[PDB]
């Protein structure tokens, strides 16, 4: 016990959105897989 062990554990709590973190990471990398395939296409620009 020692007068604060109860609230001594609430230094983290679930907050489970870190999986939406990787969800949108995956959107990032799905786009990034188009990093090296792209190149010059425009002959109509300036």
């Amino acid at each position: 016990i020692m007068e604060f062990a109860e609230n001594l554990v609430l230094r983290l709590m679930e907050n489970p959105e870190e999986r939406d973190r990787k969800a949108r990471e995956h959107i990032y990398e799905m786009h990034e897989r188009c990093k090296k395939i792209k190149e010059m296409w425009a002959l109509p620009i300036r």
Binding site: K35, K36, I37, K38, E39, M40, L43
Partner: protein, 481 residues
């Protein structure tokens, strides 16, 4: 406007050239040595330009008069030119010792470096075969002169002479390429040459004139950047010439010619047909770098072959025309330039020695141990040791080579980089943990080398902790092309 970086550094060179000539030939001032006074104002004409150039970032493209005639500035030319002036700033800064200690009253070495920097500023923004050639030869001519400068020691004279021969012959090859391309296309402007060379497919479509033209341009360039099959004198060029002029014609022409290659070979002609010679050059350049570095003794020639090998490690980023590849090539030029300015700043700190090899380089772990730490940092950086910046350069280059499907290019790169890592780890060990070997003592380096070595040593070690700015810069430059 739009030439205010050039209008200035041309007026400033004249103001310095007249100011230097009037005083050095003055009885009233007892014919003073105007070096380190036209210098200082030289390198400030660089910084004021770098301030005139960086500030007017939207203004560089302020006219059309220049566009379809002379030269086209854009974000790539802008960022690569802020780098050339910054790398010319380092190179003038490291020479300040070479002007005072070494007896040079020849100030016009400074004004020739300034005229060469204007020639390079016009190379980066060169957007027409004629302008590309003229700026190339302006900078190459300033460099032939300032590489044949030392007239007392015959060793620098013949080195400068073979540098002039190699450069004039390289420019002849490049110019015959420009001739074949122009003669077979009737258009020299890169904006015009781009429209013709869409769907050229030499290996599939019979066009021998344009093919031989692009081949000769690539050969002339690979001569200028002293790639492997055409280096042919580069070791002796870097060894014989004085140390600061070696530091100049070894880092700044690389930057400038490589930006020029990105212009002509990624916009003027875009195909997988020409980059084959650069693929072969990359392979054999990494090979030659690794092996000859394993073979050399003289620290100047060791840096020569190390620079050849690293130029090889650059061209693998050009050996594939993907944005990741070009960005890897640009990352590789910045981390090769800052590291080479550092290595040459170190070699210039050791003025006391004559032409002496790594054995005489020894004892630095004892005499000036912080300088030995810096030298090990720089040599590791060339090797590509993970916690440093050269590792980031070589690693992003290999990752671009893998993403470009050139798995064999990445393989030869990794084996050559591991050979280099072994050689440089062995060099650092031999310098630190053994081999006292005659204890040559050095006069201390000056503040100018000190800050450049210190800031660059900080850049190499504390790079992975913040690679976002440089990566953003180089990816923007690659997108702009």
């Amino acid at each position: 406007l739009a030439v205010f970086p050039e209008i200035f550094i041309i007026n400033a060179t004249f103001i310095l050239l007249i100011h230097g000539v009037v005083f050095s030939t003055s009885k009233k001032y007892d014919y003073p040595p105007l070096a380190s006074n036209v210098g200082w104002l030289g390198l400030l004409s660089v910084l004021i330009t770098l301030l005139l150039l960086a500030a007017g970032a939207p203004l560089l493209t302020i006219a059309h008069l220049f566009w379809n005639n002379l030269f086209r500035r854009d974000n790539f030319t802008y960022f690569c030119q802020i780098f050339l002036l910054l790398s010319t700033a380092g190179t003038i800064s490291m020479c300040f010792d070479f002007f005072d200690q070494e007896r040079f009253d020849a100030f016009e070495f400074i004004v020739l470096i300034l005229l060469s920097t204007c020639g390079m500023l016009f190379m980066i923004s060169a957007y027409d075969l004629i302008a590309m050639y003229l700026a190339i030869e302006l900078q190459s001519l300033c460099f032939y002169v300032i590489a044949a400068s030392k007239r007392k020691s015959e060793f620098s004279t013949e080195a400068g002479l073979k540098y002039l021969i190699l450069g004039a012959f390289s420019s002849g090859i490049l110019l015959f390429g420009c001739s074949m391309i122009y003669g077979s296309t009737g258009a020299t402007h890169f904006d015009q040459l781009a429209k013709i060379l869409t769907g050229y497919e030499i290996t599939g479509a019979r066009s021998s004139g344009i093919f031989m033209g692009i081949l000769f341009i690539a050969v002339g360039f690979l001569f200028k950047i002293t790639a492997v099959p055409f280096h042919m004198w580069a070791p002796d060029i870097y060894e014989g010439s004085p140390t600061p002029v070696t530091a100049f014609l070894s880092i700044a022409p690389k930057i400038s010619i490589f930006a020029n290659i990105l212009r002509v070979f990624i916009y003027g002609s875009y195909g997988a047909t020409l980059q084959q010679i650069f693929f072969f050059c990359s392979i054999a350049s990494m090979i030659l770098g690794a092996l000859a570095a394993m073979a050399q003794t003289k620290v100047k020639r060791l840096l020569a072959y190390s620079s050849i090998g690293h130029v090889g490690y650059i061209c693998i980023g050009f050996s594939c025309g993907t944005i990741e590849g070009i960005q890897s090539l640009l990352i590789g030029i910045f981390i090769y330039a800052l590291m080479t300015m550092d290595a040459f700043a170190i070699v210039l700190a050791l003025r006391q020695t004559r032409v002496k090899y790594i054995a005489d380089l020894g004892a630095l772990a004892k005499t000036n141990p912080i300088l030995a730490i810096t030298f090990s940092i720089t040599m590791f950086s060339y090797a590509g040791i993970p916690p440093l910046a050269g590792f980031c350069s070589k690693f992003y280059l290999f990752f671009a080579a893998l993403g470009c499907g050139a798995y064999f290019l990445a393989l030869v790169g990794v084996v050559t980089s591991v050979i280099g890592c072994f050689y440089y780890i062995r060099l650092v060990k031999r310098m630190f943990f053994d081999t006292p070997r005659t204890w040559i003592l050095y006069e201390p380096m000056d503040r100018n080398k000190s800050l450049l070595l210190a800031m660059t040593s900080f850049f190499i070690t504390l790079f992975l902790l913040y690679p976002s700015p440089l990566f953003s810069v180089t990816h923007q430059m690659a997108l702009s092309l």
